C-alpha cells in the first residue's frame, strides 16, 4: 500500500513546483470536486437492463439484476473520488407490471431515484431506441412507417414524462440525451426524406412544455455504426443544427466522429450560438469500438479545451463504453480516473499567463510550457486528490477490485437472481 | 475527329436504353442546360492577380507546377476563360477574386472601389456570364500570425474588416450592373500553426468582425455573402478560427450562405452528406468542388466518388436551385485552361449521369426497403449509356466531343499561349 | 428487355471510337474472358458452413441482414452458386472454407479428411470451375482471446497449427484431382482488443507456427498458400499478430503468395499502390476485392474508386498473370444471389474499362511528362462508351444485359429461395 | 529557479513508489543515458545549407553560417542531458572550392568531422535529392532520363564515400540516409516502371562494398508530398522489401504514413526479418508538416514500443522536424526531451510482470496498471535525470534560451 505520509511528502513538493509557476494546487483540488461525471449504468451488464430478458467480453459477475447493478455502480463510485452522477437507459425500469417502451411509467423508475437519493448522486437519462421488434430496417423515430414512428414518438415523449420525474424527485436536472440508430447500411436514393421526417418527429416528441430545472433534452449524432455504415438520419450537423434552431443541448461522443477528427475543435464552434453540451467520453479504436477511456490526446485535448476556455458550467460531462473482457467494474474506475487526472493536469496550468503569451504570438514560450507541464508533478495532485475523498492511491484500488471478485464477483453466475 | 454521325447513332440507342427503365434523356440535357458553374479566374494565372505584381503566394494554400503560357494580363485572363468556356457546353458563370482588380489607380485591399471592376462586368456582359465574387484575405503583409479579421491586433482587424466591407460594396456593384446576384464567398486563413491555449476568444473576434463586415444592407437581389470553412492549410495546421461548424452556425443565424469546399474535410469525409442536414434549417449553398489528394492540394477536379456522391445527392434530393457550384483547384503543371475544362466537363458529366437516373422509382424501391433492387440498378446505371447522353449535350452545344478538344489546346497553345514569354 | 439489336448496333459505334483512339475493343474482351474471379461459397449461407451447426459467427467480422432464402444445405448452396455464375459472363473460380467439409463422419477442425470435399471436387467438375481454399481459424471454442496458431497457450496452438496442415492437404487432393492449382488462403484473427505490452512474441509465435505448418512439401502444381493481414477487427480493434507488413515480409522470404483485401486497410489507403513495390520482390498475390464503409464491413464490391484503381493497376502494369483475383463480401440485408453477381459484374467491367484504354501511348505520354494529355484522356475514357463493350460481352456469353439480370433473380426467388 | 533539494527529494519518494511495484529508478536512467538522439543540423538555417547560396516561419537569428549552426548545436545539446548524435545533409559541406552535388568530396566535411570530435557527438549523414535545377518533374534517381539518374546515382555514390570517410574519422557507424522526392503529382499510368528503374538505380549505388563498421545506408519512403500528392515511387512496402532484401537499414518517419497510422506497429512485423531501424521522430499535423515533436499518442507508442519489445540495440532515434516560427535552438531541446522523458516513461514500467500478466490473458491489470502508471511521478525521475547530466530542470532551461537570444541570436539580423 502507498503510504499517506508519502502522498502529503509528494504533494507539499508539487504545491511548491507549481506555485513557482503561478498555479495553485489547493484551488486546482476545490476545482476538480465541482465536476461530476455521469457514469453509465450499462457498463455493468452488457445494457442488457431488465425490461426484456435476453433481448465483446465474457468476464466473471455480470449484473443481472436491480440490486447487482446497484451494488456494482456503488463499488465503482467508491473508487471514484468525489461527486458524481449515473445514467439510466429506459430498459432499467424496475417494475413488476409488464411493460413495453411505449407504457413506460415515471414510478417505474422509483427504485433508482431511491438508490440516487441514498448514494447521493444525480441522474441522467437515455431513451432506448435499440433492441426492439418495433426497430424496422435500423429505423425508429424517423422510419417510412408510420406505425413505427408512432411507436417511437410515444417513447420519446415518455422519456421525457420519466426525466421531468426524475429531477422534480431529486432536485436535480435531467439531462434527457436522445440516440437514434436510424440510417442504411448501403448507399442511399434519398437523403432529404429521412432528415425530414428526424425534424418532424423530434419536434412532436419535444411539443408538450416541460420545467428546464426538471429536464433539458441533448441530441446525440454518429457518423456509422455495424450494419448501419453508409448513412446516419441524425448526422452531427443535423443535431447541432437542431439543439441551436429548438433550445436543446448537443451530445458529442468521442467515438462517434471521422478518423483524425478532433471533438475538442467543436465547443468553441458551439457556444457563440447555443446552449450546453453534453460529451460522452468513449475510446474509439478504429470504429466506434467503446472502448474504456483512457489518458490519451483525445481525452487530453477534450478536458483541457473545456477547462481552457471555462466551459466547464455549460458541459454535461458522461461516460460512455462498454467493455466485457475485463473487470466491468474495474472499467468505469478506470474511465473515471483517467478523466479526472486529465481533468486536473489542464487545471494545473498558468492559463491566464499562457493565454497573453499566445495573444502575443509568443509560440516559443507556449510550445516549451505546455510540454514541460505533461511532465510537472500532476500525479502528487491526483494522488492526494484521491486520498483526500478516502480512495486509494495508484495501483492500491486492485485490491479492493480483487476482494469484490473473491466476495461477489467469481460467485455471482451460480447464486440465484 | 468524332462524325456528328457517330454521336447521332449512339444518342439514338441510349435514348432507347434509357427509355426503357423509365428515363427521359432529353430531358435530362435539359435539366443539366439549368446548372451553370462558377469558373475561378485565378487558376488562369496561379492566383497572381494584378494588384500587387510580384506578391507571393500565403495563407495554407499552395500552386506547384511550370507550364509555358500563364496569363499576366486581364486581356490574357479573359481571353484564356474565353478560350475555356467555349469548350464547355450550356452557359456558367466566372468567379472573381478582389486582386483581380483592372486599374491604373494605385489601391491597397481597403481602398478597392466597385468600378475598379467595370472591366470584368464589361467582359461578362460581352461573354453573357455572371460574376461571382471573392475578398483577398492573403498574399499581404497585413496577414500577420496567418490571422486577418479575427487578428488579437485591433490595427489587423479593421484594415480586413474594411476589405470585407468593400468585397460587399462591390458585389453589389455587379449585381446590379449585370441584373444577376454576386454570391460573395469569404475565405480567411485564420488559425494556428500549433496548439492553441484559447480556442474560444478566436471565433468570438471572428463572431464580432464577421457581423460588423454584413452590417450594412445590401440588396439580395444584387448580392448574398457564403462564409467558407477549412479543416487546416500548411504553416496553419493545429487550428482553424472559421471551422466548418462555425460556419454553418454563423449562416444559418444571419441567413446567409454555407460554402462547402470538398477539399476542406477530413479524411474519408463525405462532404455530400452535408445538404441534406443543413437545408432543413438554412438558406443555401455554394459549392466548392476541388480534389483533395491526402491535403487541401486543391488538384484538377476528376470524375471520382467524392464528385459523382456530390452530384448525384444534389440531384436525386433537388438542391440544385439552392446550390450554387463553383470550381476551386490551382494546377499549374499542365495546360491551364484545359485544367478549366477538365473539371469543367467532369463536374458536368457527373451531374448528367445522377439526372440519367429513374429516381422516382429508386426512391418508391427503397422506401418499400427493396435493397437488392437499389444496388442491381445503381451498379447498372454506371455502364448505362450516359457517354452518348454527355456526347450529344456537347455537340448540341457547339463544343468537341471525347478527345477532339485536345485539338482546340494544341492549336491555342500555338497560337497564343507558346507565345507569351 | 434489352433488344440484341441494340446491343450490336452500341457496340459497332463503340469499337469505333475506340479505334480513332488505337483501342481494339475484341481484343480487350478475349482479355477479360481470360481473367477468373474466385467467387467466395460464405456469402450463399452468412459464413454457417456444414460442420457445426448454429455456431456463432467470431473473429473480428460480423454479418448484418435477414433476407429470405438463405442455403442451409450443400445442395442449396451448389444451386446457389450454380445460378449465380449462370449470370455472370465467362468461366471463374469458387473459394471454399474448411467448414464447408461434407461428410456424415464426426469431425473437428483438426480431424478434417481431403474426401470431405469430394462432394466439392464432384460439384466443381460439373460446374466446370477451379477451386481455391481457406482454413477456418474463427467461430471455434479453441478461439482462446482471439488467438489461434500464435496463442501463448501450446495446446490452442497445436490445435490450429494441426488445422493449417490438414489445410494444405485437403488442398493438395482438390488440385490432384481438379488438375487446377488450389491457392489456400489462410486468415488469423489473432490479435488483442486493447493496447499489449509485448507486440515482438505473438509474431514470433506466428512466424514459428506458420513454418511448421507449410514445412511437409506438396506439389507446386496441386496447391499453393497465400497469407491474409488485416489492420483490426470487431472485438481485436489494437493489434493484429498477422499484420499486412508481417505478412509480406513472410511471403516474400518463404516464397508463398500474399493476400490484399481491400477492406483491411487503413482509411485513405490505396491497396492498388502496393502490387508494384511487391512484384520487384515476391512471386504472386491473392487480391481480395471487398468494399470497406468505415471497417472491414464486408459490402458487395461496387464500381468505386478503389475497385477501378485495383482493376486499372493490375491491367495497366501487366500483373493479372501473377495475380489470383478473389471476392470476399457478405451481405445479407439483399438477395444473396444477386450480391455475387453484383458484385463479380463490378469487378468485370472495371477491368475491361482498364483494358479499354491506349496503354502504350499514355505510357509514352507518361514518359514525356505530358501530363496534361494523360489528365484529358484518363478523364474523357471515363465517359466513353465501355458500357457498350460490357454489354457486348455479357451478351456474347449468353448472360441478361443491364437490369434484364434481375428477371433472373426474381424468377430464382419464387422457384427457390422463397420456397425454402 | 528550481532548487536541486527539491529536485532530489521528489527523487527519492518516487524512487521508493517506483520500488514499490518492482521498478528500479537508477537503473531506468543507466538505460536512457545509453539512448543517442540523432539531431538534424537542418532545423538550424531552415535546409539552406552552405553549398548553394539561396536556393513555415521567420523567428529571428536564423544560423547563417558554419560557426553559426555549430555554436546553435552546442547550444541546444548543452539543454539535453547526456550524449547525442548530429544528422548533416550533403548541403551542410564546408569548402571554397566550387561542388556541385556530383562532385562533393569526403574532406568538404572536415569541418564537421573536427566539431563533433569537439563536442564530443557522432554523425549521420543525409544525400541531398531535391532543390536542385537536376530533379526533373519531382525525379531523381529514378527519372526516366537517363542523365538525371546518372547525376543523382553520382551523388548516391559520393553520400556513401562521404559517410565511410566520416565514420573511419570518428570511430562511430554513420548511418547514411536515403530519401528521394521521386513521385508523380497526379495519378500515373505506369506504377511498376518507376520502382524498377529505382531497385536498379540504388543497386548501382550501394554496389561498391564499404565497411558497416563506417557505414550503413537506410532507406526512407514517403506516402505523399506537397506537389507530389498521387504517387510515391519509394513507397514504405518498397523500401522495407528493399532493406530487407539488401541487407540495409529501414527509415520510419513518423510523419509520413497514413491518417491513423500508428507507426510503432512496424517495429515487430519488420525485427523477424531486417537488420535495424533509423526511426524519425517527427509530429505531422494532417501532413508531413515536420512540426516539433512533442510528448503525445504518437512518441508514447515509438518510445514504449521499442524499450518494452527491446530493439532499442538495433534502432537509431533521429530527430525531423523544421520549425521556424519559434526560436530554432527551442525547437531541438523541445523534440530531445519529449523523446527522452518518453522513453523514460517506457522504461519505469514493471515490464517482466505486466509481460506475464498479460501472457496469461489478464487483460484488467494490464489496462488498470498502464493507466496508473501515466501519474505515477516518471517527472521526478526525469528531473533527476536532467540534473544528474548539468541541464536545467522544467521551465529553468526557458532562461538559457533568452540569455542565448539576447548574446547571440538576436544580434545576428
Ligand atoms: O453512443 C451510443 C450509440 O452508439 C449511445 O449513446 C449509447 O452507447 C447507447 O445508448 C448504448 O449503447
Ligand atoms: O479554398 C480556399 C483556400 O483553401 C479558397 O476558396 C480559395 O482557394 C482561395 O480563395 C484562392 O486560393
Ligand atoms: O477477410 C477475412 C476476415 O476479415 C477472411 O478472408 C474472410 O472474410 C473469412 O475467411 C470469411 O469471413
Ligand atoms: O523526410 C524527409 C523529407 O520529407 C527527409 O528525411 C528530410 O526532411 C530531408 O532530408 C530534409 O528536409
Ligand atoms: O490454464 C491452464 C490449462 O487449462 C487449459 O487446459 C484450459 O484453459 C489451458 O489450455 C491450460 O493448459
Ligand atoms: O556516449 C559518448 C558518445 O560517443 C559517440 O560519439 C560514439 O562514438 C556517441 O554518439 C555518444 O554521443
Ligand atoms: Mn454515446
Ligand atoms: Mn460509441
Ligand atoms: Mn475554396
Ligand atoms: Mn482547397
Ligand atoms: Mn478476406
Ligand atoms: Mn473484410
Ligand atoms: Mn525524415
Ligand atoms: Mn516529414
Given at each position: 500500500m502507498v503510504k499517506p505520509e508519502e502522498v502529503d511528502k509528494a504533494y507539499e513538493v508539487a504545491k511548491q513546483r507549481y506555485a513557482e509557476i503561478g498555479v495553485d494546487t489547493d484551488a486546482a483540488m476545490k476545482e476538480l470536486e465541482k465536476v461530476p461525471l455521469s457514469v453509465h449504468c450499462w457498463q455493468g451488464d452488457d445494457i442488457?437492463?431488465?425490461?426484456?430478458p435476453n433481448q465483446s467480453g465474457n468476464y466473471p459477475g455480470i449484473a443481472r439484476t436491480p440490486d447487482e447493478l446497484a451494488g456494482d455502480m456503488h463499488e465503482a463510485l467508491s473508487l471514484i473520488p468525489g461527486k458524481h452522477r449515473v445514467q439510466l437507459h429506459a430498459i432499467y425500469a424496475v417494475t413488476d407490471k409488464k411493460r413495453d417502451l411505449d407504457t413506460l411509467?415515471?414510478?417505474?423508475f422509483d427504485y433508482w431515484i431511491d438508490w440516487a437519493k441514498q448514494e447521493g448522486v444525480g441522474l441522467d437519462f437515455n431513451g432506448t431506441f435499440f433492441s426492439h421488434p418495433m426497430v424496422k430496417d435500423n429505423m425508429t423515430?424517423?422510419?417510412?412507417?408510420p406505425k413505427v414512428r408512432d411507436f417511437w414518438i410515444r417513447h420519446g415523449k415518455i422519456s421525457r414524462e420519466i426525466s421531468n420525474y426524475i429531477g422534480e424527485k431529486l432536485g436535480s436536472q435531467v439531462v434527457n440525451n436522445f440516440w437514434l440508430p436510424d440510417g442504411f447500411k448501403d448507399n442511399p436514393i434519398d437523403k432529404k426524406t429521412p432528415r425530414l421526417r428526424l425534424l418532424k418527429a423530434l419536434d412532436e416528441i419535444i411539443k408538450d412544455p416541460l420545467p428546464e430545472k426538471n429536464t433539458i433534452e441533448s441530441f446525440e449524432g454518429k457518423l456509422f455504426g455495424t450494419?448501419?455504415?453508409?448513412?446516419?438520419?441524425?448526422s452531427h450537423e443535423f443535431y447541432q443544427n437542431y439543439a441551436i434552431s429548438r433550445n436543446k443541448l448537443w451530445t458529442i461522443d468521442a467515438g462517434h466522429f471521422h478518423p483524425t477528427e478532433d471533438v475538442s475543435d467543436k465547443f468553441s464552434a458551439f457556444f457563440p450560438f447555443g446552449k450546453g453540451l453534453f460529451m460522452h467520453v468513449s475510446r474509439p479504436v478504429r470504429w466506434d469500438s467503446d472502448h474504456v477511456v483512457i489518458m490519451d490526446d483525445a481525452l487530453i485535448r477534450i478536458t483541457r479545451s473545456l477547462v481552457r476556455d471555462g466551459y466547464l458550467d455549460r458541459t454535461h460531462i458522461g461516460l460512455d463504453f462498454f467493455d466485457a473482457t475485463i473487470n466491468r467494474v474495474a472499467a468505469w474506475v478506470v474511465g473515471a480516473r483517467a478523466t479526472q487526472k486529465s481533468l486536473l493536469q489542464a487545471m494545473l496550468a498558468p492559463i491566464d499567463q499562457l493565454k497573453k503569451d499566445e495573444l502575443n504570438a509568443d509560440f516559443t514560450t507556449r510550445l516549451i510550457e505546455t510540454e514541460e507541464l505533461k511532465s510537472f508533478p500532476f500525479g502528487a495532485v491526483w494522488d492526494k486528490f484521491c486520498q483526500d475523498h478516502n480512495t486509494p492511491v495508484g495501483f492500491d484500488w486492485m485490491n479492493n477490485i480483487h476482494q469484490y471478485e473473491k466476495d461477489v464477483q467469481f460467485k455471482r453466475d451460480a447464486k440465484l437472481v
Open positions: 442488457h437492463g431488465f425490461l426484456f411509467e415515471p414510478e417505474d423515430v424517423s422510419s417510412p412507417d450494419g448501419i455504415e453508409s448513412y446516419t438520419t441524425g
